[PDB]
Ligand binder design. Structure first.
Ligand SMILES: COc1nc2ccccc2nc1CCC(=O)O
Ligand SMILES: [Zn+2]
Ligand SMILES: [Zn+2]
Ligand SMILES: [Zn+2]
Length: 100
């Protein structure tokens, strides 16, 4: 199971009123594959198995927590773990409505 809390949930920012687009491509390479959205600034970048742009974004922003547009899991780069908590329910559900 994921961690039930982490000390970076404080950095999760309010969801844009535009909502989320789970088909949004990577902001850097344009791939449609394995994208994640950053839960601090809501930019979308690809996962480590494509071109690793979300990991790069973490490195040059320090933003902690990212949501997968594949399965709606949330990863913390600092804790190196999946996290789930009530603070993540609204953004997961917006993503779920857009995806399914
Ligand atoms: C299981 O998810 C990850 N494990 C990682 C391990 C080491 C380094 C980065 C990692 N990033 C993710 C998920 C987000 C991503 O793919 O960028
Ligand atoms: Zn990319
Ligand atoms: Zn960010
Ligand atoms: Zn964390």
């Amino acid at each position: 199971s994921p961690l039930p809390w982490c000390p970076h949930l404080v950095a999760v920012c309010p969801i844009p009123a535009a909502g989320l687009d789970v088909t949004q491509p990577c902001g850097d390479c344009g791939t449609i594959q394995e994208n994640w959205v950053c839960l601090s600034c809501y930019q979308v970048y690809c996962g480590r198995y494509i071109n690793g742009h979300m990991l790069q974004h973490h490195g040059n922003s320090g933003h902690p927590l990212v949501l997968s547009y594949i399965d709606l899991s949330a990863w913390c780069y600092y804790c190196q773990a999946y996290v789930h908590h009530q603070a993540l329910l609204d953004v997961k559900n917006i993503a779920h409505q857009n995806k399914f």
